[PDB]
Structure formats: C-alpha cells, structure tokens
Design a protein around this nucleic acid. Structure first.
Lengths: 56, 224, 132
RNA sequence: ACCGUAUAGUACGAGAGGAACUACGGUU
C-alpha cells in the first residue's frame, strides 16, 4: 500500500497522483497516467505493449 | 446484555460496526456515546478496532466475518488491511473478496458455524467464504430478499429474520443455522434487522429507537 | 446535514429528468425541489450527489406514475472532489426513492453508491452492494 | 451566512421532547 504500482503498465506511481478507476462491481484499477488509461480504453492489454514494464 | 445507541442520530448500528465473539470493529469517526456502548460491556475482553474500509466508515455493511475470519472488499487499502492484521488476533484470517453483487455485509450472513450467501454468488467465491470463515455455506433468501446479511442478525445462540418470513422458512432456517430463529423487527418497525443491530454470544447493540417489545425479543432469542 | 466529506458541484436543476436507481417501478424521475440540503442555488434550484430531493414520477408503472416522492441522488455526471483531490464522475444521473421515515426499502442498488451518500443515509447504505 | 460533530440523548421535562458556552470539520 505504501508503494503503488500501476495496475496497467506496472511502473511505480508517484504518490499523490494518478487516477483510480471504479469498476462498478467495485473492482479497482489504479492508473499512473492518462496514457495508460487511454490504452486501456483502447482495450489493449499491457502485456501486448512492449514499452510497458508488465510486458518487458 | 443488550444496549441501545446511535452513530450520530442513526439507529443502524450494524452499518457502522461489526461484532463477533473474538473482536469488534467500529467506524473511525464515532462519538464517545457510541464507542462506550461497546467499551462499557466488552471492556478489556475483546479488541475494539477502529477502522475504515475502502476509505468509508460504513464498515458494518462493507465487511463480513466471524471469530475465525473477516472478509473485506478488494478496494480495502493496504493501510487499512495492515492496521486490521495488527489489531485483530492472529487466529483470525483477513481475506479480500472480489464480489460485486452488493456490499459484503449485505451478501453474507454468518455465525461461527453456518453462513448464508446471496443466491447468485459464484461457486469459486462460495468456496472461498467457506474456506476463510471455516463455515458451511448455503445460498439462500430470507423472505425473498437476496441481501441475506441485511435481513438477518445471527449469533451462535439464536437469530432474527425479516418479520414476514413464513413460519415454514423459519423452521427450515432454524435447522439450517442450528439456532432458534424468529421473525421480528428492530429500531421501531425496521425489517432490516441485519443492519439495525450487531450481536454476538454475550452482547447485542441496537439503536435507541428499539421498542420495549423488540428489545425483549432480542435478549430472549439471543439469550442475553 | 452530516458532512458529505467531499465537494460537489450540483449537476441537476429542478425539472431535470433522471434515472431511478431502484426496483420501485419508477423508470424516470423529475426533480421538483431539493429538500434535504435546502435549495442551494436558489433562483434555479440545484441538486447534486448526496442531496435529498422531492420528485415526481415521469415514467414507470401506472401506480408509480405522477406520485410525488422523496429520493436521494446516488450518482451524477458532473464531477465531485475527493479530499485526496481526485475527481469522480458517473455515467449518468440517478436517484433512489426513499421514505418519509428515510429508509430504502433497500432492496439493492443496483450499481455503486458514493460513500458520502451511504454515510448520510445509513439505511440506504445498508442495502448497497458496493460503495465507492 | 449556514450545516454537522463533541458538548449530549446531558441541563430543563411526568413524559413527549430537548438546548447552550466553548472547541472542531465542512458547505454556500
């Protein structure tokens, strides 16, 4: 909890920032920034993206 | 015994508190009159853990559990989780559960032996509940409502269910839960007995508005 | 009332048409006035999340239709401010019919509810599946 | 300028009901 990881790319999220998405079924996605969210909205999966930490 | 109190001017104690035989959870921002209701009769007996769940203070509806374990929503922050693990005894397991039917406290109704769950819950989740709470789980509906934890207050002594529950369901549920069950109301007419009061084997806390007859049924069925 | 604990910009005015979040039988509601808050913007009265509002039933079953009832705003398109600073916005605007006493039935909501609201109306909270 | 909490389910009251000084949080 003290450390935060982007539920998308996997990179660390600077504290005091980032956005949290509420699933509605109360699932939670913590996004480091808009670019990640944008990709997610795209319905791309982080593993597919080479730049993402998750992939690498 | 059985006492009355309020969180602010709310009688729905079950919404802001969670009581088991081995621990008590209360919302972080309560008043002395509210906290005392428990401190005064639990004393140094069992841990009284102040907390928030997913940042909210409606911890009674946001969690479910008994003496062996506590279930918390996924959105429970790591800080709240760490605080819980540290305050509650080691023998109790704290597990995050991912279910979106409703708040855990409305979907699950349990004592230390049996637990009723929302009838639409998935198998994987129903096994997790049984596992963590070390209890037998049954998908049920109380008088038609799927929010079992909201229409049923239960201890190992007895239980109270929706006032319209037929005698036939009461008899069947009694057998299923292994405790005497009686249809009744709390906080002056409310049929949401699950949210209106908290209770364990030795203490029952309900709202200031619970009538004399309603409190009589409570201390009688929960054997207080 | 009790502090909501978050900052809200009122999304709805009187006359706004909103979705009815429950299984009462009322599909859509019209906001007549904002009662449990007081008329905040007063010349055009405005209501937002957490407010209690008086409503009339525009669409729904005939029994429900044209009934004037109280309700609580569960969600709104316009953003809110959290203490942390994050803003949250919902897909649509919706409210749940509540009683004179202040109870829901409290079958379900369907969908998530704001923690702020649950705190103000515990009974409604007592029937929420999830609170964000 | 208002709401809320502590004060306090206290003083006052048969009961129903139900304040304040002060200290806080917030809204407009």
């Amino acid at each position: 909890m003290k450390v935060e990881i982007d539920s998308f790319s996997g990179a660390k999220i600077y504290p005091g920032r980032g956005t949290l998405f509420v699933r509605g079924d109360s699932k939670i996605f913590r996004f480091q920034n808009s670019k990640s969210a944008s990709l997610f909205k795209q319905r791309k999966n982080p593993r597919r993206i080479a730049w993402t930490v998750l992939f690498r | 015994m059985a006492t009355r109190t309020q969180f602010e001017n709310s009688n729905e104690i079950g919404v802001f508190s969670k009581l088991t035989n081995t621990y008590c959870l209360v919302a972080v921002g309560g008043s002395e009159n509210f906290y005392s209701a428990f401190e005064a009769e639990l004393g140094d007996a069992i841990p009284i853990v102040h907390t928030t769940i997913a940042g909210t203070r409606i911890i009674g509806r946001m969690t479910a559990g008994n003496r062996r374990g506590l279930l918390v929503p996924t959105q429970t922050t790591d800080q709240e989780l760490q605080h819980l693990r540290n305050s509650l005894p080691d023998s109790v397991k704290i597990q995050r559960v991912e279910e979106r039917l409703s708040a855990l406290g409305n979907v699950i109704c349990c004592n230390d032996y049996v637990a009723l769950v929302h009838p639409d819950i998935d198998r994987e989740t129903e096994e997790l509940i049984s596992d963590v709470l070390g209890v037998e789980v049954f998908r049920q509906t109380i008088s038609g409502n799927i929010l079992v934890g909201s229409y049923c207050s239960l201890s190992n002594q007895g239980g109270l269910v929706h006032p319209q529950t037929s005698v036939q369901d009461q008899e069947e549920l009694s057998s299923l839960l292994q405790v005497p069950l009686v249809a009744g109301t709390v906080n002056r007419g409310s049929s949401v007995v699950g949210a209106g009061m908290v209770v364990n084997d030795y203490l029952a806390v309900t709202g200031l508005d619970t009538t004399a007859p309603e409190l009589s049924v409570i201390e009688s069925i929960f054997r207080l | 009332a009790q502090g909501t604990k978050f900052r809200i910009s009122l999304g709805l005015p009187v006359g706004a048409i909103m979705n009815c979040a429950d299984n009462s039988g009322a599909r859509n509601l019209y906001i007549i006035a904002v009662k449990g808050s007081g008329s905040r913007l007063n010349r055009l009265p405005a209501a937002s999340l957490g407010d209690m509002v008086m409503a009339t039933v525009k669409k729904g079953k005939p029994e429900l239709r044209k009934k004037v009832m109280p309700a609580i705003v569960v969600r709104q398109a316009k953003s809110w401010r959290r203490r942390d600073g994050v803003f949250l916005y919902f897909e649509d605007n919706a409210g749940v019919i509540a009683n004179p006493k202040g109870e829901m039935k409290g079958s379900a909501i369907t969908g998530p509810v704001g923690k702020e609201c649950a705190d103000l109306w515990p009974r409604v909270a007592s029937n929420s599946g999830v609170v964000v």
